Amino acid sequence: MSSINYPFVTEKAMMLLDENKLQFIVDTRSNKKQILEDVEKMYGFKVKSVRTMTTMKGMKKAVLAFEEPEAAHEIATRIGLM
Amino acid sequence: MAILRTSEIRTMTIEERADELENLNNELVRERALTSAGGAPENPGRIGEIRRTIARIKTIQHELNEI
Amino acid sequence: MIAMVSKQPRKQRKARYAAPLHIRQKFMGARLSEALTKEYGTRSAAVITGDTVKVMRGDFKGTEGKVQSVSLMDGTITVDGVISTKVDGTEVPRPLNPSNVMITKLEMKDGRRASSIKK
Amino acid sequence: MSHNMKGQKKRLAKAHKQNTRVPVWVIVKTNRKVVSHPRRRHWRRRSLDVK
């Protein structure tokens, strides 16, 4: 099943994008391996690590750190966050 | 009419259907991302139309044994 | 079609209130003018947007015009000319009931309209 | 600090989301016939039995 729903665009998530990181809302019934494989297939960028959080609204946020510099900028460019 | 009717979905080839599916998923991701920041959507019918079209495509694939 | 075993007011008003939305198309019925009835053989018909009606009861006895919109759930139609004014002044359509109008010009664009009227 | 499992936190999140004022457009559409729901509470009152 699909594990990425949409990028998260609050003010804190914008500042993460400076040092090459994003912040997705993922499906709450998923782990880090599935998130890794989904994002890697969907954008072809070799993810480095992943940090996960459960929020009090119910959803589940995930922060992806990429290896290739400037990757998060162009992912956010094509996705439409910019 | 709609983003796709059933006739066009059944007429296309397998790769054509899959590609339409990925295009629809990407557009839905962008639409949700924009609307998640507390903004009035530029066209708040797109989400419903997109989800219903994707449901059509998945139903057609499952009926044709594609998946 | 609800036979004589429905002579209780509670049942009749239940039937008219909670009706399937394909039965509420029948409640949009209005009498036909003489020529229409003598050339289609149906004593009545249904009112559809785009036809000319002649109001017969109320404050606008005798005023004609097209039907500007129809709503199934409300059970009312909107007609040209028949309007109400706001306090600040803004002409607004006034809803009517299709049993207070007479059809003088049918709007044939569906193609299925003729079959829909009769049989 | 009441270390919770996943399900308890899930139910707590739901009970949090239920404390909402009814939307203004609902009150406009229903003509002031809906102005409240029975799910409103306050944190320093009757404890919820969610857990």
Added chain:
RNA sequence: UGUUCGGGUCGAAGCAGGGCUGUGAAGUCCUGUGGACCGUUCACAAACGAAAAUCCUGGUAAUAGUAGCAGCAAAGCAGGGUGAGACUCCCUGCCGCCGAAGGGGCCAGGUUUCCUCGGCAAUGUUCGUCAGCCGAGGGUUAGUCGGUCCUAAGACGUACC
């Protein structure tokens, strides 16, 4: 309810106050309000008549602008701001309270009370521009911190009976 004869948007029921009739239960009419239904002959029925049950439910008096807002920690004053409005909200100075607890760390428990902005009908034992209050938005990132792992008292499951 069965049956006979009727009334009503040129204003029915109901309600407030009056005139007349009847020993009386009560009937009928007039005036004000009201805006859609109500009677009558002969008979028949009943979830059929209230002043009282330390009666039941709802509304509302006096007491009464009264008691309380003291007793274990008697705490505030000056100047300057904000604001429609300042004993009570903010800054500086003086004067004070706890200082082996009224400070710091955290279990169970709570469950968003946390931060910012905008408000003051209600909540706050007074006021309030303030707020743990009301509305909108935001916030929790682990190979090394815990759970997870082992077993204690002692539970539970399957089989046998």
Added chain:
RNA sequence: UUAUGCUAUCAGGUGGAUGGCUCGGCUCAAGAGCUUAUGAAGGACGUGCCAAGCUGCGAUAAGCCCGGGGUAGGUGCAUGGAGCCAAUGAACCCGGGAUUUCCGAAUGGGACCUCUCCGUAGUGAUCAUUCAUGAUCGGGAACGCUCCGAAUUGAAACAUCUCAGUAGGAGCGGGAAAAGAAAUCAAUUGAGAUGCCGUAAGUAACGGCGAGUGAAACCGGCACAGUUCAAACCGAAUCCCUUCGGGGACAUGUGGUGUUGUAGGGCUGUUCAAACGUCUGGCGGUAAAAUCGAACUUGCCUGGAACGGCAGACCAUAGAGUGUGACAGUCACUUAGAUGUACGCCAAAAGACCGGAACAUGUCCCUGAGUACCGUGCGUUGGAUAUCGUGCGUGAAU
């Protein structure tokens, strides 16, 4: 201008009685009646552009696909903004499919953890076979069958009795269940499976013979229907699984005959021949949404608005009723009366299938055991030395 007050009426506030209305409730009658390991009912969480609750739905998430009906609008309770969908026939209704998170009979292990562990991707427990496979488990408003089983109360106290086999419990189970073809009831001589209703009758019977409890048969109705094994005679002539090769059951008996009392059957001989029932068949009926269905919206008056008053014109196998700006046979939906219908169900002619009914003959053969009966204890019953059950002991003939 006498204050604080008292009595009565009027105007206003507060309050929500009375009246009128009512998509709700309740009772009776006619139908219809099971579902789940191909994962149910129920629950948790999620799902809407603005969405908190309820309703629907399940990561394809107020929904997707196909066939029919329906025709111009649609976007639930809930007529707000902005959008989208729809003549490629939508919305809606009838029938059939798809997706269907986690818990739950819950079923790979484990639950003050609706999630978590190993992933060896998982037939949990108990069973039957040919060991391919198959069966049971949970739910259901009341009804049904089997077993265990009180006290308050009445007797104007109370113990047998009564309350009462009631309340309650455990097991099993379907659209119904239980019963059911005489080792019967009668009385002189008869009847001919069972169930349910009426009557017998508050009678017989029981009982500190107190209070109380309490039948059946005869007779009248509703509805009708009879049969199958074991054994005597023959001794594998039989059954089932299947990859159609074959394999299992079975001489500790598969199959044929046979099924009863003024006795029957087998062995022995004669005669008549084939009644009830099973299958194919679909003439013809029932049959989804649904379609058609008469005759005024005529003149003046009142009124915000006529379905009203006064005049006029029609319908009726249709004057039941509801909606509509006030009372509607003729305005709308209906009604009376007729058509139409996929999947299903029922069923008449007509064909095939096993076969049944009598008679004569006898040191011939067969006809249900810890059973029937009996002693003894207790429960229950109207059952009284004369109800039924069942603990112990004893115990036949053919």
